[PDB]
Design a binder for these strands. Structure first.
Lengths: 253, 340, 325, 324
DNA sequence: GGCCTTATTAAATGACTTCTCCGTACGCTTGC
DNA sequence: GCAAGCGTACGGA
């Protein structure tokens, strides 16, 4: 096992909008990016597998401006032609969207036979073809192996906070989020994963006709920020996949 | 009251025909509409037909996560494929004399509503039965316009189709309207676009409030942070200075120019150590390569015309090579000026 | 045989472009000197002069009218605008992020390999590089400048400065050696002979002291501020990435009416071009009809139509079957 | 053929103008010496002198009234104000920023070419150069100056300075050689015989020692500071580009009532002067009906209406017509 | 170690731009 | 002769 840090990656126009949330993308966006990097490396026979991800924020800019009342107003790109019945017209409908620019460093937890500088160079040659949450990777400082929590450059990790959510005032789960956020100003809501709305099956129109399919609702939770100088166990920030009988979950273990 | 509201919506036709027109359109439209809590047409209006789900569950009230099962959304959503069948969603939303909805009075079969409707149509029993027995919206297909996402399961991948939730969107947009939480309003849907999503709640909630899940405010990008990551270069060219050759200062007489260039660029542009450029051996090697050295010649040192602590870039365009004594003199002058 | 298009064909954009910052400088110091360029707030008092019906006009005609706005101006000391932006090119075949029919996937790969045999991608790569060389991405900022220079940097090699004012925007140049070399690098990237290519562009526009500069407007919807809002990028002025990309995509001179409309247009599925109120490719020349004719009916389209089709594949988009209930 | 004006129609500003920066100087030294002129914060104890109804008046009539403010004043050593600003002229023909009907674009280009055949753009250019020589852009600063010297520089040629006191603002001079030489270059630029023309001007106003100076005031929208805020450009005082451009646009002597008023108004879509609260061209000669009559009805308008129309096209604007 | 001043007042008159951002069945018309 | 393409109301906190 070993740990690879992707240091200070700059992302343009990450998809910032979720059904309940505008801002930080879904956690599944980042972990799916890491899985796509795994698949790209494996298709080159580097045979690395990536078991978990640590997300450290360094800068952000939501595409928008602050009102004099301090609230953000979200920008859109002018939409092009949208397929369907009205696609020929020069003016096309505007749907709900928001976009965020991120400066971020990714910790990866890695299995492989040859975890070394050659596989770092392979990640370097691979990462240029990928996207993060639909955003374009403009630039990155370095890709390197690390051994200790003193190696990470100063920044803030994002970690799960199920305790604060469950301990909130018990009227309702949305009320638990509201009261928790109103008591703990540093915490933020995040989309964590997906709940099956229907039993696994095959349906017409699939992206792939041959991989089993679910309809799902997004799951949300409460998370919070920890300075990398204040982390104690590296495992305390490693997001990993989990599945439970129709729940699809990112989580920290 | 109620008959006047019904009349007020129905166009400009003479009175008796326009009421009958509204009841005829209502009775035709009821069968086309479904009861649901998730609506595929909310993410993109172009997905054909009714796609959506009606989540009955309630168990997860302390599982540490939020969804439409374990949050108390109060209003059931009603959805249609096409805005021209939308009338029952308006009909049901009207308020009677007590200010309660037609939905409540229908569930009660209240004598007031029965009396009101029976004065306008004999079809009231069938209208009520149709409204109360609307089918649940069932997913039966998928489209290019629904967001379809692979999720790993045991090294296999399941193909998730993400449906947005309208009951939660209405509920959150309501509750954030009455709370101090940091929140953003999305204001993007037009009324026409919102209508063609075919939801009742989306027509009510065309411009929703949503949680502002952003990093801590000190991490926002600003010009001060941006300028701290852009680096200074000197204005002289070591390839054109008479008295420089092969990147090395050959004339002593230019030293006040190099000192003054360092001073002029450096003033107020201090960078703390963690933000400075690293002096890279690759840069020194590429400098030496440009002028054909294998190594720094005997008795010389490579100097940055703008010091790296004072904004200078670690680049070929910022380097110059000096003799040890001239290097000492320039270093001493810069230390004296910048108070190192 | 292939009956119809697949249920979920999707192409990622192959010619990605990043947001551009503006900087300001003095032309003779442009290689070393740069200062930030700031978006400044500038509220404005107007007369009411829009077209009004006469019964409203006689009530409104003399009223004053305040308006909010933002505007951007060089300093009184600088005279040259500077733009820095990046480009990333990806191979065409590998950018097909989805397709739900392996038979169709085989067919489209076969036709792309045929096009690589006919052209590689060199003619399209030349036209894209020519739109970098034209400095067309300046948009309104091009409308007057004394001197313009474009510098293209590829993997830390710096090519010579284009005198971008020497090109006519209506005409693409086949024989400029630097355009040819960069076009070969891009064509090699599109064909899959490399997995990626990074291109960094610097451009200098010598406008004049205190002259106005035009970043792209935001599109935002707000209850109060209908006034003009400009794009701040990291606090400095910038251009939206989509507007630079839309500048590069103006390669197309193949649409059928071209002998009567001698200007190029943006590559689009129906030839929609926002400067003209009519799509230039309805009906038989529209992209859907051409790709269906090329893959379902296996017709050997003339090379201009292959140029257009492959240019739309480079554009990327969502290209499924017309969806059904 | 042409049924109506397009869904979208926009013209870019052809007479682009910079912000203006103020400087202060002593007039004898003026070619060699300039200092920044700063804006000073003030707050002021007014009286409640506004018109009050009697029930309010008898309760508040004597009260003091503190107010926020700003002001600009020359030093006690300098005696002349200096204004630096630039102009950047662009071709009128190539200014059409958006359209939605290529027939309409062809028609408007045909009419501009017809105008360039009937006349140069010279007859407008001479009036714009007159409004430079008039120093109308001084606005309130022109009142009671001792001597006003305007210097026009075009790409490192400096033209002989204008004695701006000598021009009656109600008249446009046709035969001044320097005005004609500048106006020829402007006319060549508008006709598209040149790609651009950068004009810089320096205007010296000898006011008097320590006297007040009037930069353009900022707009405010119920902001918490309701008090007078003045425009700062690069920290020194300045004028908005809008207000100088408006001063230059005061060329119009073709509105119908002119023989009863005999003064030029700002070129405007309805001829709405602001110094006099009656519009001079509602209805029959409003811009919309003149351009529609010139293009849609293809009628050969008299040359003074073409002058006005082309002056609005020089101004630029949005002329989009909603289609039923 | 003690303390951080008492009154009075916060203006008037006008204005807040125009354009685009709708899916669909229903059935009538043109193309293969 | 049969199916694809196009103009139009329809509907609404």
């Amino acid at each position: 096992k070993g740990y690879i840090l992707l240091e200070k990656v700059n992302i343009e126009n990450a998809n910032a909008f979720n059904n309940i949330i505008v801002g930080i993308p879904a956690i599944t966006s980042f972990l799916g990016f890491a899985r796509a990097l795994e698949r790209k490396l494996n298709a080159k026979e580097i045979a690395i597998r990536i078991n978990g991800v640590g997300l450290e924020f360094h800068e952000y800019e939501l595409k928008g401006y602050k009102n004099k009342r301090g609230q953000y107003v979200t920008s859109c790109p002018l939409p092009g032609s949208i397929p369907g019945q009205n696609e020929k017209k020069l003016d096309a409908h505007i749907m709900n969207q928001a976009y965020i620019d991120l400066n971020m460093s990714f910790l990866l937890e890695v299995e492989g036979p040859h975890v070394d500088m050659s596989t770092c160079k392979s990640i370097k040659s691979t990462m240029e073809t990928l996207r993060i949450a639909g955003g374009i990777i403009r630039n990155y400082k370095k890709i390197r192996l690390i051994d200790t929590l003193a190696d990470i450059p100063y920044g803030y990790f994002l970690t799960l906070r199920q305790d604060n959510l469950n301990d909130a005032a018990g009227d309702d789960m949305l009320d638990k989020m509201i009261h928790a956020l109103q008591q703990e100003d540093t915490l933020v809501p995040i989309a964590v994963g997906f709940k099956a709305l229907s039993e696994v099956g095959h349906v017409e129109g699939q992206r792939d006709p041959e991989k089993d399919h679910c309809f799902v609702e997004s799951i949300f939770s409460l998370g919070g920020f920890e300075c990398s100088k204040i982390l104690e166990d590296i495992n305390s920030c490693l997001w990993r996949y989990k599945t439970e009988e129709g729940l699809y979950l990112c989580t920290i273990i | 009251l109620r008959n006047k509201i019904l009349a007020a919506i129905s166009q400009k036709i003479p009175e008796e025909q326009k009421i009958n027109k509204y009841i005829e359109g209502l009775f035709q439209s009821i069968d086309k509409n479904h009861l649901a809590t998730h609506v595929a047409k909310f993410t993109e209006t172009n997905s054909p037909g009714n796609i959506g789900a009606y989540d009955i569950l309630s168990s997860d009230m302390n599982c540490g996560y939020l969804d439409t099962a374990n949050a108390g959304w109060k209003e059931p959503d009603i959805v249609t494929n096409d805005a021209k069948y939308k009338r029952p969603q308006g009909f049901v939303a009207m308020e009677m004399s007590d200010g309660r909805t037609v939905m409540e009075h229908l569930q009660e079969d209240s004598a007031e509503l029965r009396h009101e409707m029976e004065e306008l149509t004999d079809k009231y029993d069938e209208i009520r039965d149709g409204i109360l027995n609307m089918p649940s919206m069932q997913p039966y297909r998928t489209n290019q316009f629904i967001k379809q996402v692979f999720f790993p399961v045991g090294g296999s991948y399941h193909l998730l189709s993400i449906l947005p939730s309208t009951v939660l969107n209405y509920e959150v947009s309501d509750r954030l309207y009455r709370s101090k939480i940091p929140k953003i309003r999305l204001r993007l849907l037009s009324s026409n676009a919102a209508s063609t999503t075919g939801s009742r709640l989306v027509s009510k909630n065309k411009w929703p409030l949503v949680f502002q899940a952003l990093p801590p405010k000190f991490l926002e990008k600003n010009l001060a942070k941006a300028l701290d990551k852009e680096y200074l270069l000197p204005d002289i060219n070591i390839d054109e200075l008479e008295g420089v050759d092969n990147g090395c200062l050959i004339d002593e007489a230019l030293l006040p120019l190099i000192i003054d260039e360092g001073k002029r660029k450096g003033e107020g542009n201090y960078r703390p150590r963690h933000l400075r450029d690293e002096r890279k051996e690759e840069t020194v090697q590429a400098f030496l390569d440009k002028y054909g050295y294998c190594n720094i010649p005997v008795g010389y040192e490579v100097h940055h015309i703008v010091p790296l602590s004072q904004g200078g870039a670690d680049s070929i365009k910022n380097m110059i090579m000096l003799s040890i004594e001239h290097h000492e003199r320039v270093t001493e002058a810069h230390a004296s000026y910048f108070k190192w | 045989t292939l009956k119809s298009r697949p249920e979920n064909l999707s192409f990622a954009r192959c010619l990605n472009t990043t947001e551009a910052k503006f900087w300001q400088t003095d032309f003779l110091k442009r290689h070393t000197f740069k200062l930030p360029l700031l978006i400044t707030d500038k509220a404005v008092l107007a007369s009411k002069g829009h077209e009004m019906p006469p019964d409203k006009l006689e009530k409104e005609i003399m009223d004053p009218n305040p308006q909010k706005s933002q505007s951007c101006t060089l300093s009184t000391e600088c005279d040259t605008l500077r733009i820095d932006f990046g480009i990333k090119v990806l191979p065409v075949k590998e950018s097909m992020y989805s397709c739900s029919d392996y038979n169709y996937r085989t067919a489209i790969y076969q036709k792309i390999d045929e096009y690589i045999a006919e052209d590689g991608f060199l003619t399209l790569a030349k036209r894209y590089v020519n739109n970098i060389a034209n400095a067309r991405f300046l948009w309104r900022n091009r409308k007057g400048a004394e001197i313009i220079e474009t510098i293209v940097t590829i993997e830390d090699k710096e090519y010579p400065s284009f005198n971008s004012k020497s090109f006519n925007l209506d005409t693409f140049v086949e024989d400029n050696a630097t355009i040819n070399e960069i076009a070969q690098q891009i064509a090699d990237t599109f064909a899959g002979k490399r997995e990626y290519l990074n291109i960094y562009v610097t451009c200098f526009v010598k406008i004049g002291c205190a002259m106005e500069v035009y970043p792209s407007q935001e599109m935002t919807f707000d209850d109060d501020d209908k006034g003009k809002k400009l794009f701040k990028f990291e606090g400095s002025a910038g251009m939206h990435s989509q507007k630079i990309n839309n500048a590069l995509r103006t390669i197309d001179t193949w649409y059928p009416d071209y002998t009567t409309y001698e200007f190029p247009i943006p590559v689009e599925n129906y030839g929609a071009a926002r400067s003209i109120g009519i799509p230039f490719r309805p009906d038989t020349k529209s992209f859907y009809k051409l790709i269906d004719r090329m893959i379902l009916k296996n017709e050997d389209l003339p090379i201009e139509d292959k140029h257009y089709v492959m240019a739309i594949l480079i554009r990327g988009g969502m290209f499924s079957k017309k969806q059904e209930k």
